[PDB]
Design a protein around this ligand. Sequence first.
Ligand SMILES: *[C@@H]1O[C@H](CO)[C@@H](O[C@@H]2O[C@H](CO)[C@@H](O)[C@H](O)[C@H]2NC(C)=O)[C@H](O)[C@H]1NC(C)=O
Ligand SMILES: *[C@@H]1O[C@H](CO)[C@@H](O[C@@H]2O[C@H](CO)[C@@H](O)[C@H](O)[C@H]2NC(C)=O)[C@H](O)[C@H]1NC(C)=O
Ligand SMILES: *[C@@H]1O[C@H](CO)[C@@H](O)[C@H](O)[C@H]1NC(C)=O
Ligand SMILES: *[C@@H]1O[C@H](CO)[C@@H](O)[C@H](O)[C@H]1NC(C)=O
Ligand SMILES: *[C@@H]1O[C@H](CO)[C@@H](O)[C@H](O)[C@H]1NC(C)=O
Ligand SMILES: *[C@@H]1O[C@H](CO)[C@@H](O)[C@H](O)[C@H]1NC(C)=O
Ligand SMILES: *[C@@H]1O[C@H](CO)[C@@H](O)[C@H](O)[C@H]1NC(C)=O
Lengths: 676, 597
Amino acid sequence: QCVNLTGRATIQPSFTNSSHRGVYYPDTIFRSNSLVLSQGYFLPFYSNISWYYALTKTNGAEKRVDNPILDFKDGIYFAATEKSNIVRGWIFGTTLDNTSQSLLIVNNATNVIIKVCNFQFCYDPYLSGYFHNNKTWSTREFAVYSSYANCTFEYVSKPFMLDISGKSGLFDTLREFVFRNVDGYFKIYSKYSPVNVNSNLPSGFSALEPLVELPAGINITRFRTLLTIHRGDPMPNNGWTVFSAAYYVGYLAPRTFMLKYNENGTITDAVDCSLDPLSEAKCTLKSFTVEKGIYQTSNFRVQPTDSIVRFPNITNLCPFGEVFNATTFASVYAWNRKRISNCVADYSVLYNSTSFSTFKCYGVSPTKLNDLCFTNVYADSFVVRGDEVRQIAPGQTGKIADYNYKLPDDFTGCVIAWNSNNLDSKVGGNYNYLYRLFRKSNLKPFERDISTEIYQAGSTPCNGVEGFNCYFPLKSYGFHPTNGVGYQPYRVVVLSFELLNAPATVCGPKKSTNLIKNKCVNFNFNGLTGTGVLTESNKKFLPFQQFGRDIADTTDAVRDPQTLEILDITPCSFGGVSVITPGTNASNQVAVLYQDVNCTEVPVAIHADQLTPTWRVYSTGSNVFQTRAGCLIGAEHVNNSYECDIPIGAGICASYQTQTNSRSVASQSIIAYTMS
Amino acid sequence: STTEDRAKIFLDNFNHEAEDLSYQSSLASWEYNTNISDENVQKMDEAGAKWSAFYEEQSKLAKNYPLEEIQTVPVKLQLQILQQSGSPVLSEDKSKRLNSILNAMSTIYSTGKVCKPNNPQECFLLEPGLDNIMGTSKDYNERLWAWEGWRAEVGKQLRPLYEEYVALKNEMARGYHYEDYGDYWRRDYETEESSGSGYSRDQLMKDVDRIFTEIKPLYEHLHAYVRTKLMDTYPFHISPTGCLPAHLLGDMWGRFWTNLYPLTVPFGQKPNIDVTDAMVNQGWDANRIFKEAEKFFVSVGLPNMTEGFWNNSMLTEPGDGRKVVCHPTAWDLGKGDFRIKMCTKVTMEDFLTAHHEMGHIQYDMAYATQPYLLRNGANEGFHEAVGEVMSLSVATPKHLKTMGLLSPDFLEDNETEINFLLKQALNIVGTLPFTYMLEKWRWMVFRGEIPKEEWMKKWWEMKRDLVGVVEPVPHDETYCDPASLFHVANDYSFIRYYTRTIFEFQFHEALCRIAQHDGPLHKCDISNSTDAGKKLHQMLSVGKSQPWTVTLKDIVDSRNMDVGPLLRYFEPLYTWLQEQNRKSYVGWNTDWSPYSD
Ligand SMILES: *[C@@H]1O[C@H](CO)[C@@H](O[C@@H]2O[C@H](CO)[C@@H](O)[C@H](O)[C@H]2NC(C)=O)[C@H](O)[C@H]1NC(C)=O
Ligand SMILES: *[C@@H]1O[C@H](CO)[C@@H](O[C@@H]2O[C@H](CO)[C@@H](O)[C@H](O)[C@H]2NC(C)=O)[C@H](O)[C@H]1NC(C)=O
Ligand SMILES: *[C@@H]1O[C@H](CO)[C@@H](O)[C@H](O)[C@H]1NC(C)=O
Ligand SMILES: *[C@@H]1O[C@H](CO)[C@@H](O)[C@H](O)[C@H]1NC(C)=O
Ligand SMILES: *[C@@H]1O[C@H](CO)[C@@H](O)[C@H](O)[C@H]1NC(C)=O
Ligand SMILES: *[C@@H]1O[C@H](CO)[C@@H](O)[C@H](O)[C@H]1NC(C)=O
Ligand SMILES: *[C@@H]1O[C@H](CO)[C@@H](O)[C@H](O)[C@H]1NC(C)=O
């Protein structure tokens, strides 16, 4: 119903700099001010943000009233913000159809309501404002503006204050914001405040505070913009015309920031890790200050796009239900070995049970044993006392460790114990459980000893009797319901876990997400966390085993348990990096080493071809330097050198040299002059 | 390996089966000792004969283990417990006669009723029907009647039985490589030359005597004080410089001086220690008394009560007819459970017995990590001493005021502190020469230097020489005047209480020094004293495993016992007494007797 009449423009994007703008605060409530890496959907710094200028200096004035196709993927930075209440309101349908669900966004103060509903409409909606006596010029206009019905998601509240009247200067506005809708969390995090420039995206410090979370969570893969052309009087020609505006569209990528969280989530120096070698150096420093010297960065030049996990499709219920509610009443000499076989267990859910006494682990913490899952597992359920529960720890030796069930000095597992009062206690004495307090030597770990021999104490050939020097090792506990807590009947299950190259058998409960084809992702697989591009390359791999090694435990190869297909991990970026001369001082430019592989393979093998323009003018398409340790892009060769003395600059002479004396246009650089 | 490892693994085996079956042995002992029935008779039969049989055969097969070959001194001292407590040298007939003697003693002493000739049917038992008769009951002609009737009612059936019992116990100790029954009672205070400098039982007699020599003046001043305060209440029945009548003490057979305190407080017209009506109106029952005890014990830094200590171990009558022979009794059952019983009232002395056996339990859990044959007191004295130190520290009126027991308007002047020290002086020092003379009389009897025809004329002469008490009728020799007490009927060792009071003020000197609380040990409450409490906790935890002389050297930096803690506990009371008995004369005279006068 809307036709592309006069006024429309072509795509004509302005791929300008995103600057140091647009950082939101996850975890709005105050934290322990850790300056740790924050990984997820986040906005690239200084990326090619598409600025379109919808100005009205002339009649046309290159009016960006167009409705261009714009992809959402994993988030948007939107700074289409101005105090003059122009182009307010936007439509964010997933495909912009009747099938798609449109998540409107209100940036005006007259009605703060966010509803999805259906919102089926044509190519171009519109809004206008003619005249009103309260400096609002009737911003609400008689139009269609699509429709709302049977709304799946709704947010109604008081129309609180956002903006009013008009901007005093050209873009006297710093009210930028970022959206991405995921898992019942929606970010409308904004920075409503006026800051005036001439005409540019300002390089002010990205410190936009959290605003609200919404439980909508509907997936968005594409979106669209929305315009407001004034009917009454934008100009005295009384035509349909958007007032002077200059609006911004950027996208969020999987990447990492450095956030202080000092005072309720505030920050001092926001640093996007995949910006430049200085930024990744800062991310590796775990602080907000660059050092001065040779420096190795973390492997986050390109971040994992997705966190792929590939567990075997087991969906089995483990016998742990009859392990903690077990009728199997063993003893420490007759300790069980109940193999759980191939199953999926509710790991650390028994840890949530408040009726249990001691869940010490010694090697794999209760948190990391839900997602790292295990090739082999045994139960080891039997009965001990309280001092014996203290004894059953692997580093402790005694009559229940040395002369009974012994644990190895590493054990890579966990042990649980709890009280079996009124479960293993008989009023006349529950002697049915036993122990072996006598043995010829200490028991090796996981050595069963049912042998009820005469124990041959001294040199007495007993042969079935307990003489003066002959003693029966198989001796009972002697529980009572009145017995004390140190001698109380305790049921212990020594949940022995071990991970080998064998395929995983019992794993933690989670959904195995569908594998990606070719992208640098956070591979988990059978709990094997790490970073790299998933590839279908086939190598000499044994079919049964899954854990690869490659070189120095690079573990390139890992098996998909569903289709039994090898899936190699080739890291998206490699180590062996070195910031030759960082930028703590006025040497603003920066370059880090990449690989002994030549830098011509950086966009294609190290995969920097789809990065920010900073990685273009700094790392893919700029000056190339090479050393014995590898190659880097960002610094340039020179024939002048000196004795290499200071540890700055790897091997070929480079340090914090100055260049302002020759010319003050660019100040210092990273030209490899001399290790000062 | 050598035989030391064989002895170690044997003691490991013996300890574990000892806990395993002695737990239900002590449990059945507790079950009989809390409910009287007809099948608990067979419960005693099994919990006796069975445990005795396995303990005796495990010690009997230990005889081949050489003691001197053992290098490990806890294992060594385990062998001196186990091997020296070997097979009884009496025959089966003689030993079963001895056990029947013990049963006859307990039964006929626990059934004693002094009954008036006009109405012999209506009369009271000893506890709790006759303890009041020697107390608040004035007009002492019926006190004389009850005294003489009780002495006759024990004498006419227990004089020759005790006389023959002495010969059997002396024969039992003679085969145990000990000279007499007193020596087997004193074997608990035995050390080695490497650590405890030997400390034979000859050192025990000389130490007991040198303790008694300089507690005699304090007791003499106290006895003169009590004589002067029984002058006005009791006309002409007490000599000004003589002894005091035996039938006119606080309780039966002159054991405690507790109920003489209302009759002997100087200026108790002001509000004082007594809180019994406030115990009634505050709702503080026996159980709340015990929660007060565990607040005191978590304040001092000792472990609190266990869940078994909640649910089992009923103190008083449970309302279900469970008849109990209630006496203040703790129970180290072994393993993990510990129990308490007595007819728990709300009075002061029973409140201190509650803390006393509660400290017994704290002692028992503190060396609960020890072997079972080591799971006893560090001697016969420490085991009662720790609980009595707890009972004495909790009794201080400053402590009573701090945790809300005592009235807010109570005064901490010198005179009321002297009144409290006087109550403690009765409850302790009126028993010191009594227990000294009784245990020394036992030692003389078991040594046998006095024949049976002169036991009584000896008994009443150090009753006038060591404890300074005269009696109305010496009962010739046909009665059994020293045999009507509880610990002598059931034949408990009675140096336990004497050395309890000896080590009591030594441990209280430690718990006033390391705890650093002010006041010359009078208001020196040990609550909220973690460092001194934990130092006491290692002093408990070493237990019997290291000899108690070394334990004393650890706690008070003195390897031997001494009287001087009595001086630092009682010196304002003592100095008060010299300014109190200045009218009378300190000491006693054996010449004046109610039968002689
Ligand atoms: C096993 O016994 C426990 C109680 O001992 C049962 O109780 C809980 O059940 C919930 C599920 O409704 C579990 O999440 C808890 O872990 C269980 N335990 C506790 C301590 O809360 C449980 O239902 C029993 N299971 C079976 C299969 O009989
Ligand atoms: C009295 O003591 C006995 C111990 O001998 C307790 O044990 C029960 O005694 C009754 C006698 O009427 C027997 O019928 C039961 O079989 C005994 N129970 C056992 C052996 O487990 C008895 O509980 C005590 N009385 C009360 C009221 O508790
Ligand atoms: C219980 O489980 C939750 C996961 O839902 C976990 O966050 C929590 O830490 C567990 N409880 C304890 C005490 O660890
Ligand atoms: C003993 O003290 C511990 C520590 O305060 C407490 O957890 C326990 O419940 C207490 N036991 C009692 C009061 O029986
Ligand atoms: C101890 O617990 C048992 C069962 O839990 C109960 O029957 C008994 O009354 C308890 N004893 C107490 C609370 O003294
Ligand atoms: C000290 O002990 C008393 C008991 O007498 C108790 O009430 C109090 O809470 C303890 N602590 C302090 C700080 O007074
Ligand atoms: C002891 O108490 C009395 C009051 O009964 C007092 O006069 C006297 O001074 C006190 N003694 C000392 C040493 O203060």
